[PDB]
Amino acid sequence: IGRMEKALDEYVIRGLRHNICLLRDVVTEPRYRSGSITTNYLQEQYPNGFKKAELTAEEMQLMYEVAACVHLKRERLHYTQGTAPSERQLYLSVGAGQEGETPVYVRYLDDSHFEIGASKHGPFRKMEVVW
Amino acid sequence: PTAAEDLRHKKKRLTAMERVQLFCDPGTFRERDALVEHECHNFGMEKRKVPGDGFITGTGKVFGRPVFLFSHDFTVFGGSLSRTNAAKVVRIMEEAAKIGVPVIGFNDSGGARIHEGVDSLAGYADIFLRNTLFSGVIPQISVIMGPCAGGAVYSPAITDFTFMVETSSYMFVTGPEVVSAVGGKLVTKDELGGPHVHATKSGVSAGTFPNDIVAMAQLRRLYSYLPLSNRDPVPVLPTADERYRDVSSLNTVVPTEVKEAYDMRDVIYPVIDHDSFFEIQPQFAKNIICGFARVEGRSVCIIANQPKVQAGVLDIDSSVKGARMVRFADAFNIPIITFVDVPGFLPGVQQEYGGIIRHGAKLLYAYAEATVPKVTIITRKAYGGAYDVMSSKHLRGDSNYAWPHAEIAVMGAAGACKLLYSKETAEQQAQRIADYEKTFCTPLSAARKGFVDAVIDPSETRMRVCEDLERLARKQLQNPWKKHGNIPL
Amino acid sequence: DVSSLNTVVPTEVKEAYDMRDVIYPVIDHDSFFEIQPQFAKNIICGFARVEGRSVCIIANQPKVQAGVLDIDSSVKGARMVRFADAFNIPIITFVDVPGFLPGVQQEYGGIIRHGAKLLYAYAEATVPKVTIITRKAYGGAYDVMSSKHLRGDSNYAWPHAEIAVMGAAGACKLLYSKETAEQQAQRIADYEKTFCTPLSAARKGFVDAVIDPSETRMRVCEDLERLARKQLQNPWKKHGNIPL
Ligand SMILES: O=CCCCC[C@@H]1SC[C@@H]2NC(=O)N[C@@H]21
Ligand SMILES: O=CCCCC[C@@H]1SC[C@@H]2NC(=O)N[C@@H]21
């Protein structure tokens, strides 16, 4: 299953819609991983239309961190020669109303390594992003 | 400390200094002049002097490259110009003429300052002359953040590109009060000169943005494309994308039926680098696309027809749009890449009553006068004078290519069959139109004459374009000596 | 960090100071090569480096003769400016002048010819120029020492500067012919307060900005880096006709 989970996310499809979200949500459901299912499983678990399951706090935090890293990496490309920055303090907030402003730092110690933290003078984790 | 700007933000609007701070780098703005007064002494203006005098001019720095800018201030006197306001702008433009640096201005003026008399006209004239002289020397970009009325509208017009903000901006020559006075019609300011009107109807505005923040964010991206001056070379940026990336999806873009339509962006996007298109005038004359893009890390100019809208037929508005884009691109040594799909010109009385002859000649003049490297690709068809206009090989074109299902003919098969057989026996349609289209509506004849270099598979377009654009990097061509041309206005 | 420049200028207008205390912090360490050190000591000329590039230095000195322009100083500065411009070398000047040296010997020796040489050299030059007014600039001396109107690139002043037509006494005398006696006390002070300050010259637009003395190195490096590629040309001539 884990393999499928991972393999679903690496399938790049552009130009038309698909049902990969439904497959992902069905596989990730703890009912499906319980061990047994039924033939009325789908409509039993999807009474009104279809609604994809949401994200937990840590997943949304990780998405924020990766977004900040990507922003910094693409920003450094446009600068000329060595006149480029290496650290910022960003304020990420999804939604049109800025729901949950989360301050973020970034350091870009190498080509594919950062020092993400809460802000300046905050403990750093040194994750990795390759894009 | 957030003093004196609470009144501004309460109206859901930003300040000039905040806009300047958002545009440039975090700490690289050096305000030039800050303690200047109007010295008017008329109509009870001897009092209420202001330190900044309603203008903010500085130098700044974007992406490590220098810039010059100025911003109007709406709080102070409504942003009106004077004998003294225009002096700062003139000094900035003169300095940016000595050094090869561009100029960007954020217009917010409410009109002229009446209390100065004709001195406002003097300042306007000086700014107009500087814009006229320095156009083609340094790129000029203008953004309109608020009201812009009176005769001040003309200086943004001479500038290369004008952008507009959606909710709280407008521009026109004469106010609606005079329109009501003379004609008797009641029209609001937005109905007269709103951003939508200039985006779709008049064709003056080159774009529209939803917010000031987005305006700055994308203005930086636009600035990343431009060359610094007239004599400086085209910028080249590092990029991980490579010319060996596979593009085989182009083999299927063109439908096998001649009456079905397709989107030209499906051809434009694969050739250029990923996520590197900046469309210019997206909502005006949609049958033609113009903008900037990068090919192997160097900025180029894109001009292509679109059979999605009106069968990709040339027109007045499309001609003006393409002509302006080509002229600007050539003025600053930027390569041009074109994609051709045209059945001809739009037929109609309104067209001749509006002067198609003048307007359609502008694109041809711009294409013929240009001396930058050109690359042309004929995908499906090219008929009549439209084939000549859209950068044909005879107009000193560098390299021309065609796709295996193209067609290059004098006109459609029906008209040729009609003219070639006056009173030939009836039913001549079936056994003559098919034969003529088979024999002469194909790139074989044009290739025999030598009008296309080679017939290529659609999968090799990126390879060919990168090769040619790399080889043509150092072309030196010059026109005969002239004081200047005489373009059909 | 150069914060020692905040204290170089004394708070009294009649006390003297050494201009080298202003010259040395701005340029790089141990990089001054004085030219003609023992002749016309009221003016200093030489070569120096700013951020690794050679520049030309021309500054007055209130230590010697109150920093007053003269014949010999004019010749020295004119020759230095002409040589520096001939070979595309940036020029940086520091201004502190009360005027020209008064005396019969001066007119009997041709001050009119010699003082025009420095003005000609400053006006003819096309290299980037930077000017800093520390304390004062009066009369034609302000015009001569690379004023903004002579196609100067950037001009700066310090917060206690003074730019006026002449001293307060002469202006008060000419502005009130036979005004009631004791006019000295309540007129000279007022005129010096109102017009012997950089506010009026800044209002007219003759100085770009009024800066803290601690930012001089930053401003000079920024301007000299930006001005690296200026291209200016004079009208066509076989050659000039300088006042010999
Ligand atoms: O066959 C009759 C109408 C054909 C029009 C073909 C297109 S419409 C605009 C343009 N002008 C032409 O003469 N041909 C094209
Ligand atoms: O007040 C009387 C004498 C003031 C002289 C002030 C200095 S001396 C040389 C120069 N020439 C002037 O007119 N003023 C300055």
DSSP string, B136-184: TTS-EEEEE-SEE-GGGGHHHHHSSEEEEESTT-EE-SS-HHHHHHHT-
DSSP-H helix ranges across A1-131: 2-9, 20-28, 30-34, 41-45, 57-78
Rounded to 5 degrees, what angle do the CA atoms B332, B334, B339 make? 140
Retrieve residue B331's tokens.
């003025």
Q: For residue B63, list chain A residues with Cβ-Cβ distance below 8 A.
A: 78-80
- CA-based angle A65:B269:B202, to the nearest 5? 100
The residues, ordered by sequence, that sit 6+ positions from A71 with a Cβ below 8 Å of its Cβ are A90
Is some CB atom of chain A closer than 8 A to the CB atom of B65?
Answer: yes
Q: Which of B310, B318, B346 is the pocket-test mutation for ligand 1 (most atoms within 8 Å of CB)?
A: B346
**Interior/surface letters B155-164, b for 16+ CB within 10 angstroms, e for the rest:** bbebbbbbbb
User: What does residue B15 show for φ and ψ, rounded to 5 degrees?
Assistant: -105, 160
**Do the beta carbons of residue B162 and residue B202 sit within 8 Å?**
no
A83 touches chain B (CB under 8 A): yes
B-chain CB neighbours of C153 within 8 Å are 95
Burial class (CB in 10 A: 0-12, 13-18, 19+), A40: exposed
Is residue B355 within 8 Å of residue B381, measured between CB atoms? no
- The separation between CA B75 and the C-alpha centre of its own chain, rounded to angstroms, equals 32
CATH superfamily, domain B5-224, is 2-enoyl-CoA Hydratase; Chain A, domain 1 (3.90.226.10)
Residues of chain B found within 8 Å of residue A86, distances taken between Cβ atoms: none
The residue among C230, C221, C229, C231 whose CA lies nearest residue C52 is C221
CA atoms within 13 A on the CB side of C27: 24
Q: Show the tokens assigned to A124.
A: 């750093």
CB-CB contact of C156 with C92 (8 Å): no
Ligand 1 atom with the smallest distance to the CA of B414 is 1
CB atoms within 10 A of CB B408: 23
* Chain C: residue whose CA lies nearest to B85: C205
Residue B234 CA to residue B224 CA, distance in Å, equals 11
How many degrees, rounded to 5, is the angle at CA B101 between CA B100 and CA B106? Answer: 155
Q: Pick the closest to residue B273 from B290, B251, B293, B249 (CA basis).
A: B293
Q: Residue C24: count other Cβ atoms within 10 Å of its Cβ.
A: 17
Domain B249-472 has CATH 3.90.226.10: yes
Angle between helices A20-28 and A2-9 (to 10 degrees): 150
Residue C65 DSSP code: G
Spatial neighbors of C132 by CB under 8 A, at least 6 apart, are C92, C93, C94, C95, C155, C156, C157, C158, C216
Closest C-alpha among A110, A77, A108 to residue B64: A77
B63 touches chain A (CB under 8 A): yes
Is the Cβ pair C203, B66 closer than 8 Å?
Answer: no
**Radius of gyration of chain C, Cα coordinates, nearest whole angstrom:** 18
Residue pair B395/B363 in contact by the 8 Å Cβ criterion: no
* Rounded Cα–Cα distance for residues C5 and C21 (Å): 8
Q: Do A77 and B238 touch (CB under 8 A)?
A: yes
B346 lines ligand 1 (CB under 6 A): yes
Residues 6+ positions from C32 with CB-CB distance below 8 Å: C23, C24, C46, C47, C48, C57
Q: How far is CA B238 from CA A80, A82, A111, B109, B215, in A?
A: 9, 13, 14, 40, 25
What pairs with residue C57 in β-bridges? C46, C92
Which ligand places an atom closest to the C-alpha of C139?
2
Q: Which amino acid makes up residue C135?
A: R
Kindly state the DSSP code that residue B326 receives in the 8-state scheme: H
Question: What is the residue with the minimal CA distance to atom 13 of ligand 1?
Answer: B344
For B456, the token pair is: 């290529």
Q: Which amino acid is at B406?
A: A
Cβ of A78 within 8 Å of Cβ of B239? The answer is no
Question: Which residues in chain B have their CB less than 8 angstroms from residue A84's CB?
Answer: 64
| C205–B100 CB contact, under 8 Å | no
Q: Is the CB of B238 under 6 A from ligand 1?
A: no
Residue of A nearest to B239 (CA): A77
Which two three-digit tokens encode residue B302?
């894109």
Report the alpha-carbon distance of residue C55 to residue C130 in Å, rounded: 11
Taking the C-alpha atoms of residue C40 and residue C64, their distance in angstroms, rounded to an integer, is: 9
CA distance C1 to A83: 22
Q: Which ligand gives the minimal distance to the CA of B413?
A: 1
Structure tokens at B206: 């080159």
CA B103 to chain centre: 17
Q: C-alpha distances in angstroms, B8 versus B15, B74, B190, B209, C121?
A: 7, 9, 21, 21, 50
Give dist(CA C63, CA C216) in Å, integer: 22
| DSSP state for residue B67 in the 8-state scheme | -
> Is B147 in contact with B129 (CB distance < 8 Å)?
no
Written as one letter, the residue type at B129 is L
Pick the CATH number of C4-227 from 3.90.226.10, 3.40.50.300, 3.40.50.2000, 3.40.50.720: 3.90.226.10
Question: What number of CA atoms fall less than 13 Å from residue B33's CA on the CB side?
Answer: 29
Helices (H), ranges, B277-376: 316-331, 349-353, 356-369
Q: Order of strands across the sheet with B207-209?
A: B55-58, B69-72, B103-107, B140-144, B161-165, B207-209
Q: B342: which residues sit within 8 A by CB, 6+ positions away?
A: B305, B312, B313, B314, B381, B382, B383, B386, B387, B390
- DSSP character string of A51-71: ------HHHHHHHHHHHHHHH
Q: Does A91 touch chain B (CB under 8 A)?
A: no
Chain breaks in chain B (C to N over 2.5 A) after: none
> Which chains would you list as touching C if contact means 3+ CB atom pairs under 8 Å?
B
| Angle at A29 (CA atoms; ends A28, A30), nearest 5 degrees | 110
> Mind telling me how many Å the CA of B32 is from chain C's nearest CA?
6
* Helix %, strand %, coil % of chain B (to 5): 40, 20, 45
Start-to-end C-alpha separation, chain A: 25
Mark out chain C residues that contact chain B at CB-CB < 8 A: 153, 199, 202-203, 205, 208-210, 222, 226-227, 229-232
Chains C and A are touching, with contact defined as 3 or more CB–CB pairs separated by less than 8 Å: no
Residues 6 or more apart whose Cβ sits within 8 Å of residue C11: none
Question: What residues are in contact with ligand 2 under a 6 Å CB criterion?
Answer: C 68, 98-100, 102, 167, 169
- Written as six digits, the tokens of C66 are 């109150």
Q: In chain B, which residue's Cα lies nearest the Cα of A76?
A: B63
Residues in Cβ contact with C151 at an 8 Å cutoff, skipping those fewer than 6 apart: C123, C126, C232
Whole-angstrom distance, CA of residue A23 vs CA of residue A64: 25
Give the end-to-end CA distance of chain C in Å, rounded to a whole number.
Answer: 44
Q: Closest-CA residue in chain A for B240?
A: A77
Domain residue spans in chain C?
A: 4-227
Q: Does A78 touch chain B (CB under 8 A)?
A: yes
Q: Which amino acid is at B285?
A: A
Instruction: Report residue A10 as tokens.
Output: 């690496």
**C-alpha C10 to ligand 2 mean position (Å):** 21
Does the beta-carbon distance from B98 to C232 stay under 8 Å?
Answer: yes
Q: Please determine whether the domains at B5-224 and B249-472 fall in the same fold group of CATH.
A: yes
- Whether there are 3 or more C-beta pairs closer than 8 Å between A and B is yes
CA distance B2 to chain C (A): 24
Question: What is the distance between the alpha carbons of residues C124 and B274, in angstroms, rounded to a whole number?
Answer: 52
| Position in ligand 1 atom list of the atom nearest CA B346 | 9
Method by which the coordinates were obtained: cryo-EM
Q: What distance lies between CA B111 and its chain's CA centroid? A: 26
**How many CA atoms are closer than 13 Å to the CA of B311, on its beta-carbon side?**
13
Residue A87: closest CA among A57, A123, A116: A116
Q: Contact A102/A64 with Cβ under 8 angstroms?
A: yes
User: Does B224 lie at the interface with A, CB-CB under 8 angstroms?
Assistant: yes
Q: Which of B41, B28, B117, B131 is nearest to B89 (CA)?
A: B131
Stated as kind and residue range, the H or E segment containing B340 is strand B336-342
Interface test with B, best of A80, A90, A91 (most B CBs within 10 A): A80
B36 to C230: CB separation less than 8 angstroms, yes or no = no
Sign of CA dihedral B79, B81, B84, B87: positive
Give me the active site residues of B, please: 150-151, 385-386
CB pair distance less than 8 Å for B239 and A77: yes
3-state helix, strand, coil split of chain A in percent (to 5) is 35, 15, 45
Chain B: closest CA distance from residue A13 (Å): 14
User: Considering only CB atoms, which chain C residues are within 8 Å of B31?
Assistant: 209
Q: Which residues contact B253 (CB under 8 A, 6 or more apart)?
A: B262, B266, B267, B458
Which residue's alpha carbon is nearest to atom 14 within ligand 2? C99
**Ligand 2 centre from C98 Cα, in Å?**
7
User: Which chain B residues touch A80 with a CB distance below 8 Å?
Assistant: 63-65
Residues of B within 8 A of C230 (CB-CB) are 98-99
- The phi-psi region of residue B4 (left if phi > 0; otherwise alpha if psi is between -120 and 50; otherwise beta) is left
Question: What b/e string do you get for B362-396 counting C-beta neighbours within 10 Å, with b at 16 or more?
Answer: bbbbbbeebebbbbbbbbbbbbbebbebbbbbebe
Can you give the C-alpha Rg of chain A in angstroms?
Answer: 19
Kindly state the DSSP code that residue B481 receives in the 8-state scheme.
Answer: P
